[PDB]
Design a protein around this nucleic acid. Structure first.
Ligand SMILES: [K+]
Ligand SMILES: [Mg+2]
Ligand SMILES: [Mg+2]
Ligand SMILES: [Mg+2]
Ligand SMILES: [Mg+2]
Ligand SMILES: [Mg+2]
Ligand SMILES: [Mg+2]
Ligand SMILES: [Mg+2]
Ligand SMILES: [Mg+2]
Ligand SMILES: [Mg+2]
Ligand SMILES: [Mg+2]
Ligand SMILES: [Mg+2]
Ligand SMILES: [Mg+2]
Ligand SMILES: [Mg+2]
Ligand SMILES: [Mg+2]
Ligand SMILES: [Mg+2]
Ligand SMILES: [Mg+2]
Ligand SMILES: [Mg+2]
Ligand SMILES: [Mg+2]
Ligand SMILES: [Mg+2]
Ligand SMILES: [Mg+2]
Ligand SMILES: [Mg+2]
Ligand SMILES: [Mg+2]
Ligand SMILES: [Mg+2]
Ligand SMILES: [Mg+2]
Ligand SMILES: [Mg+2]
Ligand SMILES: [Mg+2]
Ligand SMILES: [Mg+2]
Ligand SMILES: [Mg+2]
Ligand SMILES: [Mg+2]
Ligand SMILES: [Mg+2]
Ligand SMILES: [Mg+2]
Ligand SMILES: [Mg+2]
Ligand SMILES: [Mg+2]
Ligand SMILES: [Mg+2]
Ligand SMILES: [Mg+2]
Ligand SMILES: [Mg+2]
Ligand SMILES: [Mg+2]
Ligand SMILES: [Mg+2]
Ligand SMILES: [Mg+2]
Ligand SMILES: [Mg+2]
Ligand SMILES: [Mg+2]
Ligand SMILES: [Mg+2]
Ligand SMILES: [Mg+2]
Ligand SMILES: [Mg+2]
Ligand SMILES: [Mg+2]
Ligand SMILES: [Mg+2]
Ligand SMILES: [Mg+2]
Ligand SMILES: [Mg+2]
Ligand SMILES: [Mg+2]
Ligand SMILES: [Mg+2]
Ligand SMILES: [Mg+2]
Ligand SMILES: [Mg+2]
Ligand SMILES: [Mg+2]
Ligand SMILES: [Mg+2]
Ligand SMILES: [Mg+2]
Ligand SMILES: [Mg+2]
Ligand SMILES: [Mg+2]
Ligand SMILES: [Mg+2]
Ligand SMILES: [Mg+2]
Ligand SMILES: [Mg+2]
Ligand SMILES: [Mg+2]
Ligand SMILES: [Mg+2]
Ligand SMILES: [Mg+2]
Ligand SMILES: [Mg+2]
Ligand SMILES: [Mg+2]
Ligand SMILES: [Mg+2]
Ligand SMILES: [Mg+2]
Ligand SMILES: [Mg+2]
Ligand SMILES: [Mg+2]
Ligand SMILES: [Mg+2]
Ligand SMILES: [Mg+2]
Ligand SMILES: [Mg+2]
Ligand SMILES: [Mg+2]
Ligand SMILES: [Mg+2]
Ligand SMILES: [Mg+2]
Ligand SMILES: [Mg+2]
Ligand SMILES: [Mg+2]
Ligand SMILES: [Mg+2]
Ligand SMILES: [Mg+2]
Ligand SMILES: [Mg+2]
Ligand SMILES: [Mg+2]
Ligand SMILES: [Mg+2]
Ligand SMILES: [Mg+2]
Ligand SMILES: [Mg+2]
Ligand SMILES: [Mg+2]
Ligand SMILES: [Mg+2]
Ligand SMILES: [Mg+2]
Ligand SMILES: [Mg+2]
Ligand SMILES: [Mg+2]
Ligand SMILES: [Mg+2]
Ligand SMILES: [Mg+2]
Ligand SMILES: [Mg+2]
Ligand SMILES: [Mg+2]
Ligand SMILES: [Mg+2]
Ligand SMILES: [Mg+2]
Ligand SMILES: [Mg+2]
Ligand SMILES: [Mg+2]
Ligand SMILES: [Mg+2]
Ligand SMILES: [Mg+2]
Ligand SMILES: [Mg+2]
Ligand SMILES: [Mg+2]
Ligand SMILES: [Mg+2]
Ligand SMILES: [Mg+2]
Ligand SMILES: [Mg+2]
Ligand SMILES: [Mg+2]
Ligand SMILES: [Mg+2]
Ligand SMILES: [Mg+2]
Ligand SMILES: [Mg+2]
Ligand SMILES: [Mg+2]
Ligand SMILES: [Mg+2]
Ligand SMILES: [Mg+2]
Ligand SMILES: [Mg+2]
Ligand SMILES: [Mg+2]
Ligand SMILES: [Mg+2]
Ligand SMILES: [Mg+2]
Ligand SMILES: [Mg+2]
Ligand SMILES: [Mg+2]
Ligand SMILES: [Mg+2]
Ligand SMILES: [Mg+2]
Ligand SMILES: [Mg+2]
Ligand SMILES: [Mg+2]
Ligand SMILES: [Mg+2]
Ligand SMILES: [Mg+2]
Ligand SMILES: [Mg+2]
Ligand SMILES: [Mg+2]
Ligand SMILES: [Mg+2]
Ligand SMILES: [Mg+2]
Ligand SMILES: [Mg+2]
Ligand SMILES: [Mg+2]
Ligand SMILES: [Mg+2]
Ligand SMILES: [Mg+2]
Ligand SMILES: [Mg+2]
Ligand SMILES: [Mg+2]
Ligand SMILES: [Mg+2]
Ligand SMILES: [Mg+2]
Ligand SMILES: [Mg+2]
Ligand SMILES: [Mg+2]
Ligand SMILES: [Mg+2]
Lengths: 208, 38, 174, 141
RNA sequence: GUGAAGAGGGAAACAACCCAGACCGCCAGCUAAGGUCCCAAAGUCAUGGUUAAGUGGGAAACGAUGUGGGAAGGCCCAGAC
RNA sequence: CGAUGUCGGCUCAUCACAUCCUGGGGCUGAAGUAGGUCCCAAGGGUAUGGCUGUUCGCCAUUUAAAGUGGUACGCGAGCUG
RNA sequence: UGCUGAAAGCAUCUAAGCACGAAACUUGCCCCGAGAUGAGUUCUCCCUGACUCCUUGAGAGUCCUGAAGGAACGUUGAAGA
């Protein structure tokens, strides 16, 4: 199915033969089920979960009630996962990191680090025009953005300057290294999106 | 096969057929005489 | 026209039924069903079957003459049961049947397990020969055509899967 | 002497059902578009939406002559750099059977606010069941 | 001949093509070109055929047991193809 | 003509298919390897240098390939000159 | 490329019918996405006081109540012009 977990930086695991494998330390606390959606009411089968612990004043009543419907404590944020027909869960159940004990690889989804207003050099890997040889006020500019009279217009999806990052991105089929049950951790090989403290939706690899 | 615009019966065993709109000249003796179109 | 004007004989122990246009012929080998074309009109007249072209429709004789020649084969199928004799030519080529799955080894890196749709009875008198039987000419012919299509005759040594009746043109090296 | 024009407030709109099973697409779509517009009514006014509400159930079972089941194509652009998407009459029914009658009627209705207003009147459906039992939609042929 | 110096209806849009020459008004009727299932006024008109290619709704030499009409020309009961 | 900046390069591209590579097929004077030609196929990919303002071209060395064209012989209120 | 099979005693992949068949096409993978005005669904939360007036209209008031929640303000951020 999948679990929600905060990103807690990166380390490396030295294997006894020698190889130092770079790992991202994902803390994955008891992900507790707030709601179970089904075909009769909703038209699809899914589960809504929660994690962490939000201060009671910060949780509003429309969500304070929503948690009382289930019986669980008010976790910070809510996320949904689609069920793969066979499995079925109940409201108030606590899903832990032990689900990834069996799996080998995982897709990790997160929110990428915000680079703000980025230019075409950084954003789209555009080439910087000649830094000298007569160049006038146009080193890092995009150059042309179209043709002439024929279109007489710029085409849609033209690669231009704009907001870069702060977008949800997915890294697929990262190899799981260690699944720590006692500290509630999930060590995955490589790097996953977002900064330390950003939330990560970790789930089993669709590309098997 | 050939896709010439003027297919014709080359040898004796050549046979004209209209498959899916297109005229074809299928042959038993020589596969060289197999030809489409026209 | 000419085929259409030649009644199909129906031997004893061959239950024929005409559900409007949907024909059902049951026999000893297998029960066969044929959804026939709307332009054809078919009836029972004495022992034999009759196939008439419908008035109003453009191409009748062509459609009916087909029904005739189909049901002719359909009656022979349920009575006798058709067979096809395939042979595998070339060293290292092997054919062995386990149940309803033909294990073809045809010089590949993986032994090819061909499945048999419908009532098709597969046999092997020798290790390099496949004799398969059944009710329909259609399914037999197709199965045979796939079993062939895995390795067609090489026009040099005649290597591959061949029909027994088929002649193959080989040529010299140049 | 100031001839009659149908005043919206006074327009008494009616509900209908049409089973499109085995019907010719265009010949259905036409007779729909004539009704939706309110041509059949003797108080027809071109600037007022006088026509009737229609429910077209069993849209997927609509019939077409010749080889148009495969040959008839429905093109549309995505508004993108080189994005021209086509879908044949089969492929269209495989994904979205409502779109077939929709597009066949929309082309036959006028183009503009009232034309879009008289499209809304139409209610296409893939399944035989319709949830507009509340209006007592009478049978039309 | 038309435009130039002529509006109006038709030919999708289209000075010169087809129809036709605006003195002004009317919420009258008959017709021209061109049209009459829907966009859009009027035939889902009548009868007899053709077309199966979506031809109609761009094109040649040449190619083809497509498919309709015809007018002829090669054989039978010694039974031809 | 009361001004539509004309070659080449850079930057940025986009479409066509008459396909250079990669994918699927027919024939072959197709043993295999490698071709030859033809057919369908536009998803993606498609050199770096020397010389010259060059486009092109020749040459050196790579590459699976180093496609042919349209886009004001694309692109100067984007650069160069 | 075939299978069965006429029209056309046969023959032939097709006219009924039936199987295969590619980086193309539709999905599958990632992202945005109910302003999808056709504005979908689920879930939770909150408001349960009176009087006038008239053309008794989806009306206009007059005090009284001000909720859920939001915005504003502050400290700010691996968010950001
Ligand atoms: K607030
Ligand atoms: Mg619930
Ligand atoms: Mg759904
Ligand atoms: Mg606290
Ligand atoms: Mg408080
Ligand atoms: Mg808040
Ligand atoms: Mg969310
Ligand atoms: Mg989602
Ligand atoms: Mg996310
Ligand atoms: Mg940031
Ligand atoms: Mg960069
Ligand atoms: Mg980068
Ligand atoms: Mg550079
Ligand atoms: Mg540079
Ligand atoms: Mg300068
Ligand atoms: Mg300067
Ligand atoms: Mg400078
Ligand atoms: Mg300046
Ligand atoms: Mg310019
Ligand atoms: Mg324009
Ligand atoms: Mg891996
Ligand atoms: Mg050609
Ligand atoms: Mg074909
Ligand atoms: Mg594309
Ligand atoms: Mg003059
Ligand atoms: Mg005029
Ligand atoms: Mg005029
Ligand atoms: Mg006009
Ligand atoms: Mg014209
Ligand atoms: Mg003109
Ligand atoms: Mg005009
Ligand atoms: Mg005239
Ligand atoms: Mg006059
Ligand atoms: Mg005059
Ligand atoms: Mg006059
Ligand atoms: Mg007047
Ligand atoms: Mg009169
Ligand atoms: Mg009149
Ligand atoms: Mg006329
Ligand atoms: Mg006409
Ligand atoms: Mg119009
Ligand atoms: Mg109009
Ligand atoms: Mg008009
Ligand atoms: Mg009309
Ligand atoms: Mg009628
Ligand atoms: Mg009639
Ligand atoms: Mg007729
Ligand atoms: Mg014509
Ligand atoms: Mg043409
Ligand atoms: Mg000719
Ligand atoms: Mg000819
Ligand atoms: Mg004829
Ligand atoms: Mg003729
Ligand atoms: Mg005749
Ligand atoms: Mg005559
Ligand atoms: Mg005659
Ligand atoms: Mg000037
Ligand atoms: Mg001037
Ligand atoms: Mg000027
Ligand atoms: Mg100029
Ligand atoms: Mg110049
Ligand atoms: Mg240069
Ligand atoms: Mg250069
Ligand atoms: Mg570029
Ligand atoms: Mg093309
Ligand atoms: Mg060529
Ligand atoms: Mg090459
Ligand atoms: Mg490759
Ligand atoms: Mg291959
Ligand atoms: Mg090839
Ligand atoms: Mg090949
Ligand atoms: Mg080869
Ligand atoms: Mg090799
Ligand atoms: Mg050679
Ligand atoms: Mg080659
Ligand atoms: Mg050629
Ligand atoms: Mg091509
Ligand atoms: Mg293209
Ligand atoms: Mg390309
Ligand atoms: Mg492309
Ligand atoms: Mg494309
Ligand atoms: Mg694709
Ligand atoms: Mg790319
Ligand atoms: Mg390139
Ligand atoms: Mg060079
Ligand atoms: Mg030098
Ligand atoms: Mg070299
Ligand atoms: Mg090489
Ligand atoms: Mg090579
Ligand atoms: Mg080469
Ligand atoms: Mg080329
Ligand atoms: Mg070129
Ligand atoms: Mg152009
Ligand atoms: Mg051009
Ligand atoms: Mg040019
Ligand atoms: Mg030019
Ligand atoms: Mg050019
Ligand atoms: Mg230029
Ligand atoms: Mg160019
Ligand atoms: Mg330029
Ligand atoms: Mg500038
Ligand atoms: Mg200078
Ligand atoms: Mg100079
Ligand atoms: Mg046959
Ligand atoms: Mg004939
Ligand atoms: Mg055959
Ligand atoms: Mg299938
Ligand atoms: Mg298939
Ligand atoms: Mg193939
Ligand atoms: Mg493959
Ligand atoms: Mg594949
Ligand atoms: Mg690939
Ligand atoms: Mg998304
Ligand atoms: Mg959304
Ligand atoms: Mg989403
Ligand atoms: Mg909504
Ligand atoms: Mg929304
Ligand atoms: Mg908008
Ligand atoms: Mg919508
Ligand atoms: Mg609605
Ligand atoms: Mg009250
Ligand atoms: Mg009151
Ligand atoms: Mg008033
Ligand atoms: Mg009110
Ligand atoms: Mg009131
Ligand atoms: Mg009130
Ligand atoms: Mg108060
Ligand atoms: Mg108070
Ligand atoms: Mg207040
Ligand atoms: Mg207050
Ligand atoms: Mg209070
Ligand atoms: Mg408050
Ligand atoms: Mg509050
Ligand atoms: Mg909020
Ligand atoms: Mg706030
Ligand atoms: Mg705001
Ligand atoms: Mg602030
Ligand atoms: Mg600060
Ligand atoms: Mg700051």
């Amino acid at each position: 199915i999948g679990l929600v977990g905060k990103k807690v930086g990166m380390t490396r695991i030295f294997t006894e033969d020698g190889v130092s494998i770079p790992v991202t330390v994902i803390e994955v606390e008891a992900n507790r089920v707030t709601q179970v959606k089904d075909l009769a009411n909703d038209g699809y089968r899914a589960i809504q979960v929660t994690t962490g612990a939000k201060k009671a004043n910060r949780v509003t009543k429309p969500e304070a009630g929503h948690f009382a419907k289930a019986g669980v404590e008010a976790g910070r944020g809510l996320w949904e996962f689609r069920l793969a027909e066979g499995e079925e869960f109940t409201v108030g159940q606590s899903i832990s990191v032990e689900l990834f004990a069996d799996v080998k690889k995982v897709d990790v989804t997160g929110t990428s680090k915000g680079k703000g207003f980025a230019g075409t050099v950084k954003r789209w890997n555009f080439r910087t025009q000649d830094a000298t040889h007569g160049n006038s006020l146009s080193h890092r500019v995009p150059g042309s953005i179209g043709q002439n009279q024929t279109p007489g217009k710029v085409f849609k999806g033209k690669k231009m300057a704009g907001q870069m990052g702060n977008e949800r991105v997915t890294v697929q089929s990262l190899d799981v290294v260690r699944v720590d049950a006692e500290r509630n951790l999930l060590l995955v090989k490589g790097a996953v999106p977002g900064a330390t403290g950003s939330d990560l939706i970790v789930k089993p690899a669709v590309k098997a | 096969m050939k896709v010439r615009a003027s297919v014709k019966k080359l040898c004796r065993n050549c046979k004209i057929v209209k498959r899916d709109g297109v005229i074809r000249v299928i042959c038993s003796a020589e596969p060289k005489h197999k030809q489409r179109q026209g | 026209s000419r085929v259409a004007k030649a009644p199909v004989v129906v031997p004893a122990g061959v239950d024929v039924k005409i559900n409007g246009q949907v024909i059902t012929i049951k026999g000893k080998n297998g029960e066969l069903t044929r959804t026939l074309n709307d332009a054809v009109e078919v009836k029972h007249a004495d022992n034999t079957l009759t196939f008439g072209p419908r008035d109003g429709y453009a191409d009748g004789w062509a459609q009916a003459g087909t029904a005739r020649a189909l049901l002719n084969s359909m009656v022979i199928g349920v009575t006798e049961g058709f067979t096809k004799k395939l042979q595998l030519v070339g060293v290292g080529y092997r054919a062995a049947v386990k149940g309803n799955v033909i294990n073809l080894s045809l010089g590949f890196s993986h032994p090819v397990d061909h499945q048999l749709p419908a009532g098709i009875t597969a046999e092997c008198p020798t290790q390099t020969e496949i004799v398969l039987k059944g009710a329909d000419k259609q399914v037999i012919g197709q199965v045979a055509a796939d079993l062939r299509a895995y390795r067609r005759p090489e026009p040099y040594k005649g290597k591959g899967v061949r029909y027994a009746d088929e002649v193959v043109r080989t040529k010299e090296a140049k | 002497m100031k001839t009659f024009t149908a005043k919206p407030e006074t327009v008494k709109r009616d509900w209908y059902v049409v089973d499109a099973t085995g019907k010719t697409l265009g010949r259905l779509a036409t007779e729909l578009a004539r009704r939706l517009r309110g041509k059949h009514k003797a108080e027809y006014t071109p600037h007022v939406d006088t026509g009737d509400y229609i429910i077209v159930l069993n849209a997927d079972k609509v019939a077409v002559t010749g080889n148009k089941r495969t040959d008839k194509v429905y093109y549309h652009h995505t508004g993108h750099i080189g994005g021209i998407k086509q879908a044949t009459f089969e492929e269209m029914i495989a994904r979205r059977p409502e779109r077939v009658i929709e597009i066949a009627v929309k082309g036959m209705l006028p183009k503009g606010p009232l034309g879009r207003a008289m499209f809304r009147k139409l209610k296409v459906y893939a399944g035989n069941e319709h949830n507009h039992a509340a209006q007592q939609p009478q049978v039309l042929d």
